[PDB]
Amino acid sequence: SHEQFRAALQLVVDPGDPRSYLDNFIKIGEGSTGIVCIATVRSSGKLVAVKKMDLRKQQRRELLFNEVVIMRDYQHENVVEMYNSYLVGDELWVVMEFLEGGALTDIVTHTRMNEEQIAAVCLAVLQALSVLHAQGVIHRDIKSDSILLTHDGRVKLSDFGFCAQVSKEVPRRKSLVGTPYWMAPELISRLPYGPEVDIWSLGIMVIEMVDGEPPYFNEPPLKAMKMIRDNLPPRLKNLHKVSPSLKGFLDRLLVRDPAQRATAAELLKHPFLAKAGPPASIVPLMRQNR
Numbered sequence: 001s002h003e004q005f006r007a008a009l010q011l012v013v014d015p016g017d018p019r020s021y022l023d024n025f026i027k028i029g030e031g032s033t034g035i036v037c038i039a040t041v042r043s044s045g046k047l048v049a050v051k052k053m054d055l056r057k058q059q060r061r062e063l064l065f066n067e068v069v070i071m072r073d074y075q076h077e078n079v080v081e082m083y084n085s086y087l088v089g090d091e092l093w094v095v096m097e098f099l100e101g102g103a104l105t106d107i108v109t110h111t112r113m114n115e116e117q118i119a120a121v122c123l124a125v126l127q128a129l130s131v132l133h134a135q136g137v138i139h140r141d142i143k144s145d146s147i148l149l150t151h152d153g154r155v156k157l158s159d160f161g162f163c164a165q166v167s168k169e170v171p172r173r174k175s176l177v178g179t180p181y182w183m184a185p186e187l188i189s190r191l192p193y194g195p196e197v198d199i200w201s202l203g204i205m206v207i208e209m210v211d212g213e214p215p216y217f218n219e220p221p222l223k224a225m226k227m228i229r230d231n232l233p234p235r236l237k238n239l240h241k242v243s244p245s246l247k248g249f250l251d252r253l254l255v256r257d258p259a260q261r262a263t264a265a266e267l268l269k270h271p272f273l274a275k276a277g278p279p280a281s282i283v284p285l286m287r288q289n290r
């Protein structure tokens with residue numbers, strides 16, 4: 001049953017105990033699939049992040065493979081770097097880069113962002129999504145919560161628990177996964193869907209950065225989901241705070257027809273993204289700076 005998973009892991013993971021070089025573990029967080037900790041590296045004095053998870057008590061064990069097997073070795077400035085993974089008892093530990101700035105979701109709830117800062121975030125996420133989409137990877141869970149910030153103000157994509165690899169021969173997936181408010185129409189349709197569901201989800205994230213919340217966030221998840229499927233492209237509640245430039249950009253992401261919805265490739269050219277400021281424009285927005 002479970003020790004078949006254990007055995008496959010032992011192919012992948014680096015062997016040996018990461019306690020041979022890691023200590024002063026401290027809990028950051030948790031999102032059901034495991035606990036997450038900060039730990040110090042003895043040899044060098046640096047901090048890392050460590051996701052730990054017991055193999056037996058995982059329920060969508062399938063997904064546990066997807067982060068490790070996909071995320072292992074993708075080189076990208078705007079993606080969260082995995083260092084190693086280890087088998088430690090009946091537990092998988094994954095060691096990652098530690099982003100000091102935390103999630104963007106902390107920022108969008110408390111403050112409102114200007115367009116320079118919005119453009120930067122979008123730029124970073126589109127750079128990363130273009131490559132991931134250039135190698136078959138649909139993230140399938142884009143939202144402010146899965147964006148992390150360095151102290152420099154750099155933006156990196158993470159939280160690949162739900163990602164899926166896709167190819168020339170089977171170019172779509174069926175599986176109903178994601179966060180409701182952020183899921184595309186076709187995904188709730190139970191239709192086959194491609195790497196464009198990232199783009200809709202991104203659009204919903206822009207509405208997060210401008211409004212503070214996504215559409216229908218008052219509703220229950222089941223209500224909101226028919227609403228996104230059935231009804232029109234949702235709209236910015238604060239349309240008046242927003243450029244015609246950004247408004248255009250946004251109208252090319254929230255296309256309900258998937259066919260004519262735009263692409264990381266395409267969107268990387270748009271005039272909206274030339275407003276993007278450097279990493280330093282983002283710093284002030286953080287909790288140490290607020």
Ligand SMILES: CCn1c(=O)c(-c2ccc(Cl)cc2Cl)cc2cnc(Nc3ccc(N4CCNCC4)c(F)c3)nc21
Nearest residue numbers: 029036049050051067094096097098099100101102103
């Ligand atoms: C659970 C978050 N998390 C991960 O899950 C992972 C991760 C994801 C998938 C895998 Cl396979 C392994 C890991 Cl290791 C990496 C990670 C790296 N850096 C950070 N930085 C960080 C800094 C401060 C805060 N907060 C400030 C204010 N209030 C809430 C606490 C914060 F939420 C986050 N978080 C990561």
